[PDB]
Design a binder for this molecule. Structure first.
Ligand SMILES: [Mg+2]
Lengths: 333, 49, 61, 653, 145
DNA sequence: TTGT
DNA sequence: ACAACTGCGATTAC
RNA sequence: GUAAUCGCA
């Protein structure tokens, strides 16, 4: 709670490289993550990532708790890292009261509200619905940061529709004077949208984030972008996996698939479905590394021979192949 | 003189500040890998933990 | 022995009397010069030592 | 094992004009503000007195003498009687004149200037933040041009919206007359600006979030198919992408560093403390006088009349900016701007950067008090911990200690009498000097200090000469030969330094080189020759005898002491062979050779003759006698080593 | 001799240090993208390149020193070498809020971030010459100045 | 100059 | 654009 | 206080 993320890191390094009795625990990692997350001086985002990588010790009783997931979600939200934030929020959902812990009494900008706003702005509304369901399950009311934009239509409910930053047509005309007296008329208390020279965001939604609010992207744009990314990684797998594929028709189907993929990224659908993208499958990568699928010290130029040479010299082994998915045991992914 | 100066700068910071860091990995020294010089193997092994 | 004017002044007295010479805590004149030069170049430099006991920042001038 | 936590964090950054003003601004008792430098004068004419409101002014910086002032009345600071801190008549305060060393100043600039480091370096931070090209900014700074829209946060009636206006030929006289002239002046800043206002308005009126957003968008757009193109197009795309990434990084750092890009253009210029640029006169001060003169001429032209021609004030602005550039960093633009003697002017960048710069010459290397150098000679009867030191050096190094000794004993009343007695070379002074340094360590060192053994510690022994004696075995470490080499001497004052010198830096604690851990102190030239002569051997075969002994050594000594005494008495030569009886040790290194001849008698005693020893035994397999065949040299070496070990062990008790 | 010593330490080019080393390094850089996928290809390639470069960088310097009869222990050469081969260069393809293209991070830090973050971090081993390394340090007053 |  | 041994001592010229 | 020039090891 000092505000300097380097005084706690010294104690963390004293614990980590000390004896066994003074080795760190889950509470220590949580405290250092809280210290680095709530800094006010510099970026401190790669520090949290390196600390999380150091936190990967499965058979050392170092397992995450509710506070770990809450702090990781808060950190990745404040720095617009939405994917890992959702990854850790999926784990936080399993604990009871985890959303209440994420809403740390609203003292630090309502990190749950910041998470909801980050989900709303980019357009990942299915994860927003999941978060709302989790909040309803944990009996957590919506934080009061349901901020309206310059157009009072904006809310977490419908700011992701195709018409963005534009108000829909209604039977009655928009009464801007009524709104004026509603926000506060001549009571000298209104948000005047005028740019200022100082380094202060005029938009009130940017408050709470280290740099800025996540960029505004609609749900349809996010869907088409993820579709293009899926097809692009499929084409990448086809490229770096050779012509050999489950499909037996090589000549015409290769050209058809490559041209259709080039068109998509910028009825033979079974051929594209045959290509499987193996991402995050540690077993497949371990089986591939195991090979199942002058006059100085030099390693053999072949890849599998280099692998067996490393395994003989103990440089790297299949036991060292692990990630958080496996370590923290998140099965759902 | 020039070579002695630059080297010091790059590695100036390093200082022994811990008794053990906890690493479980170590390099494998084998004679037949590098034509097996006996004197070089002895010089390599001597002084290490 | 080189640059610390006050310490050097005190060294002769402490040696003549025979007392122990305390360890200097102030910055030498060479560092102070640098600060002055760099601040003539519109660049700041502050020591800013932080106490581990009470987490307070103290500037050394 | 909780460690002792020491937290020290040096911080550097760009300073606002408010801070560089507060570094100099001071409020006198009358109520005036001092700190502004406004006159190029440094000193009075043929009076050698600091000129008022000048580069060396007493009022803004401080008094030139301790307790004295420019008004002419001396005062004592800290006296019991109430004394005014500063004279009413003269601004100079009554303080010790150390402030002139640490006190800064500042010159107010009518036209802003741009920092050379940010602008004219190949990576231009200003050109990075303002996407405008570097050539456009360098022109707008140095070559009279115009920027149409420098402000983006205020209303703009004119719709020029241009980057570089190469000429003012656009209709502006009809525009100024139409509007009220005062009104035209009011909005011209939002209108086309020139020289140094457009850059400041662009840096000030800027949204870093919009900048990073647009740069991320342009980065996402580029790179789709640029690599497929030619090497030239791919190179252009790559360079643009790198520029965009650098812009993103600069803006992201500016967001969360409590530093503003507005401070890159200098509104006010700080002035170094006077003592640091003492006038003999320095270029620093020559450039300071030049920029002061140009700035006051510019201020005069501005305050004279608004109807003044723009060409003159613009040229004087360019001259002021060039003077500021030459003061800050000269040589980046490529123009030397030599002096009257065709010699380049030095700048602050030249002061800090370089081998002879501030850092390497002062901070990382410096000379000390209590030091002396002299030539070195061999002292062959010294021990590894003792070194010969001349007396004329020791008296100067340990002068304060011998003064304290003369004061303590009833030999000197005061420091002056003691110094006079030391200068008179009285005999008691040398006795006190000897008694002083009996337990004090001396740090010797050499100029080519390549390894860590260049600096060691010894015990100084008073000698009568001018040459520092050194132990022979310690020469290898210092790479020292007595062909003219010289060495330095250092005296540790503090008790901690004395303990460190006596424990760590001594020779007996450093006998192995830190490269491979090999003995560094070994017999080298003459001792090696002596040892080789001792242990060489004797003529064994045809050299010792002219005829074969078949047709046909002698001395037998029970103790090594007897053989050494016989050698001292010239009874036996150094290489003369002899037999020495040993007391059942068999420690002689020899070849794995069987006995050359074995004599076995009836009674049971068999004599076994070996190459270098005779071993008589009896029927009971009992070793009766052992006689080693050697020379006085080997037994002398063995005895001297054994007696050294035994004498060490006995002296320990 | 000594010019050859300066050359290896300031790694101006990997072809200078060895042709077989450059060949193997480019072969790994090309092939390792195919097998082992995204998360376990960069890490293993970095480890293999670190091992081969360290072994090579040492063997060369030790042979150059021993050809003249200078006997030095490999530990001193190792400390320096580690610094040369301790940083990694992020590729231009990957840009995120955590890291930017063209940045220089540490090998252990890069591996720990790759293990934790699903976001694809494309990093390749840049052997840094003594001088470059100094110019890139945590202290701006000691090694940068 | 020599090379970076 | 940048850097290329370490220091010391003597003189004369500004 | 800075240069130039030579020497030193
Ligand atoms: Mg010599």
């Amino acid at each position: 709670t000092c505000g300097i993320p380097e005084i706690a890191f010294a104690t963390f390094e004293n614990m980590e490289y000390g004896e066994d009795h003074m080795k760190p625990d889950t509470e220590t990692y949580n405290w250092v993550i809280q210290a680095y997350t709530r800094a006010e001086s510099y970026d401190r985002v790669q520090d949290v990532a390196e600390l999380l990588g150091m936190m990967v010790e499965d058979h050392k009783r170092v397992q995450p708790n509710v506070r770990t997931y809450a702090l990781l979600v808060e950190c990745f939200t404040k720095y617009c890292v939405v994917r890992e934030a959702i990854r850790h929020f999926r784990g936080l959902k399993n604990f009871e009261g985890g959303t209440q812990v994420l809403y740390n009494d609203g003292k630090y900008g309502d990190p749950l509200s910041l998470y909801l706003r980050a989900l709303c702005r980019e357009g990942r509304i299915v994860e927003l619905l999941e978060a709302l369901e989790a909040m309803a399950k944990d009996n957590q009311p919506i934080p009061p940061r349901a901020m309206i934009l310059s157009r009072k239509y904006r809310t977490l409910v419908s700011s992701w529709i195709e018409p963005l930053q534009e108000e829909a047509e209604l039977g009655y005309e928009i009464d801007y004077i009524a709104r004026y007296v509603a926000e506060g008329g001549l009571t000298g208390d209104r948000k005047r949208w005028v740019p200022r020279r100082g380094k202060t965001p005029l938009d009130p939604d940017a408050e709470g984030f280290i740099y800025s609010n996540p960029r505004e992207t609609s749900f349809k744009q996010r869907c088409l972008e993820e579709w293009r990314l899926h097809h692009r990684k499929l084409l990448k797998t086809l490229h770096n996996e050779g012509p050999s594929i489950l499909g037996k028709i090589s000549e015409s189907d290769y050209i058809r698939l490559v041209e259709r993929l080039r068109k998509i990224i910028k009825e033979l659908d079974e051929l594209i479905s045959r290509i499987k993208l193996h991402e995050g499958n540690t077993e497949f990568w371990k089986r591939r590394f195991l090979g199942e699928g002058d006059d100085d010290d030099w390693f053999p130029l072949d890849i599998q021979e280099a692998f067996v040479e490393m395994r003989k010299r103990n440089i790297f082994d299949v036991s060292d192949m692990y990630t958080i998915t496996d370590a923290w045991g998140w099965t759902w992914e | 003189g020039y070579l002695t100066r630059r080297l010091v700068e790059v590695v100036q910071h390093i200082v022994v500040r811990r008794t053990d860091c906890g690493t479980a990995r170590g390099i494998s020294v084998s004679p037949r890998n590098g034509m097996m010089p006996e004197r070089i193997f002895i010089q390599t092994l001597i002084g290490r933990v | 022995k080189s640059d610390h004017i006050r310490a050097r002044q005190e060294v002769l007295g402490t040696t003549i009397i025979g007392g122990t010479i305390p360890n200097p805590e102030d910055a030498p004149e060479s560092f102070r010069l640098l600060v002055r030069e760099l601040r003539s170049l519109a660049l700041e430099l502050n020591h800013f030592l932080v106490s581990e006991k009470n987490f307070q920042i103290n500037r050394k001038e | 094992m909780i460690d002792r936590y020491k937290h020290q964090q040096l911080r550097i950054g760009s300073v606002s004009p408010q801070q560089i003003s507060a570094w100099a601004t001071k409020i006198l008792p009358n109520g005036e503000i001092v700190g502004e430098v406004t006159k190029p004068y440094t000193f009075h004419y043929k009076t050698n007195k600091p000129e008022k409101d000048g580069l060396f002014c007493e009022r803004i910086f401080g008094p030139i003498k301790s307790g004295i002032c420019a008004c002419g009345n001396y005062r004592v600071i800290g006296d019991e009687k109430e004394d005014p801190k500063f004279c009413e008549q003269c601004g100079v305060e009554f303080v010790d004149s150390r402030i002139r060393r640490y006190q800064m100043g500042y010159i107010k600039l009518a036209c802003p200037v741009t920092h050379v480091w940010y602008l004219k370096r190949l990576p231009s931070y200003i050109a990075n933040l303002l996407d405008k090209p570097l050539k456009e900014l360098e022109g707008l700074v140095y070559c009279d041009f115009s920027f149409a829209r420098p402000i983006t946060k205020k209303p703009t009636f004119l719709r020029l919206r241009g980057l570089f206006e190469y000429e003012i030929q656009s209709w502006k006289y009809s525009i100024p007359l139409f509007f009220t002239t005062q009104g035209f002046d009011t909005f011209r800043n939002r209108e086309i600006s020139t020289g140094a206002g457009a850059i400041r308005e662009q840096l000030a009126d800027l949204d870093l979030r919009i900048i990073i957003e647009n740069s991320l968008v342009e980065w996402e757009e580029l790179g789709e198919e640029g690599h497929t193109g030619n090497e030239w197009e791919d190179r252009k795309v790559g360079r643009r992408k790198d520029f965009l990434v650098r812009r993103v990084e600069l803006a992201k750092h500016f967001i969360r560093t409590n530093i503003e890009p507005e401070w890159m253009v200098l509104c006010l210029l700080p002035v170094l403390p006077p003592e640091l640029r003492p006038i003999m006169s320095s270029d620093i001060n020559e450039l300071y006088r030049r920029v002061i003169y140009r700035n006051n001429t510019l201020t005069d032209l501005l305050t004279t009349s608004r109807s003044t021609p723009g060409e003159l004030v613009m040229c004087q602005e360019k001259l002021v900016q060039e003077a500021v550039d030459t003061l800050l960093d000269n040589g980046i633009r490529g123009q030397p701007m030599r002096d009257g003697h065709n010699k380049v002017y030095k700048s602050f960048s030249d002061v800090i950067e370089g081998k002879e710069g501030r850092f390497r010459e002062t901070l990382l290397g410096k000379r000390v008090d209590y030091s002396g150098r002299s030539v070195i000679v061999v002292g062959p009867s010294l021990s590894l911990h003792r070194c010969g030191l001349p007396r004329e050096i020791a008296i100067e190094l340990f002068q304060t200690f011998v003064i304290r000794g003369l004061i303590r004993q009833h030999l000197a009343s005061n420091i002056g009498v003691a110094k006079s007695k030391i200068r008179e070379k009285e005999p008691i002074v040398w006795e006190i000097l000897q008694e002083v340094m009996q337990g004090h360590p001396v740090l010797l060192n050499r100029a080519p200090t390549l390894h860590r053994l260049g600096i060691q510690a010894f015990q100084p022994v008073l000698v009568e000469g001018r040459a520092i004696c050194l132990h022979p075995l310690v020469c290898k470490g210092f790479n020292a030969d007595f062909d003219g080499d010289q060495m330095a001497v250092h005296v540790p004052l503090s008790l901690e330094a004395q303990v460190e010198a006596r424990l760590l830096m001594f020779s007996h604690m450093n006998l192995l080189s830190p490269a491979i851990g090999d003995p560094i102190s070994v017999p080298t030239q003459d001792m090696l020759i002596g040892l080789y002569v001792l242990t060489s051997g004797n003529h064994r075969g045809i050299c010792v005898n002219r005829y074969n002994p078949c047709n046909r050594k002698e001395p037998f000594f029970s103790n090594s002491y007897d053989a050494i005494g016989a050698y001292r008495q010239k009874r036996i030569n150094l290489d003369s062979p002899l037999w020495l009886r040993w007391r059942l040790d068999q420690r002689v290194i020899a070849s794995r050779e069987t006995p050359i001849e074995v004599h076995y008698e009836s009674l049971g005693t068999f004599y076994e003759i070996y190459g270098h020893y005779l071993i008589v035994r009896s029927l009971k397999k009992q070793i009766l006698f052992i006689y080693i065949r050697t020379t006085v040299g080997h037994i002398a070496l063995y005895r001297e080593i054994e007696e050294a070990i035994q004498g060490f062990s006995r002296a320990y008790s | 001799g000594l010019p050859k010593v300066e050359q290896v330490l300031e790694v101006r080019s990997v072809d200078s240090i060895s042709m077989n080393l450059e060949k193997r390094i480019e072969g790994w850089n090309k092939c390792i993208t195919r097998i082992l996928g995204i998360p376990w290809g960069f890490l293993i390639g970095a480890e293999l390149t670190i091992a081969q470069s360290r072994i090579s960088l040492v063997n060369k310097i030790q042979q150059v020193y021993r050809s003249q009869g200078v006997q030095i222990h490999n530990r001193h050469l190792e400390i320096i070498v580690r610094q040369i081969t301790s940083k990694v260069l992020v590729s231009e393809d990957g840009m995120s809020n955590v890291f930017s293209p063209g940045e220089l991070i540490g090998l252990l830090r890069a591996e720990r971030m790759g293990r934790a973050l699903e976001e694809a971090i494309c990093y390749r081993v840049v052997l840094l010459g003594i001088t470059r390394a100094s110019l890139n340090t945590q202290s701006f007053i000691s090694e940068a100045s």
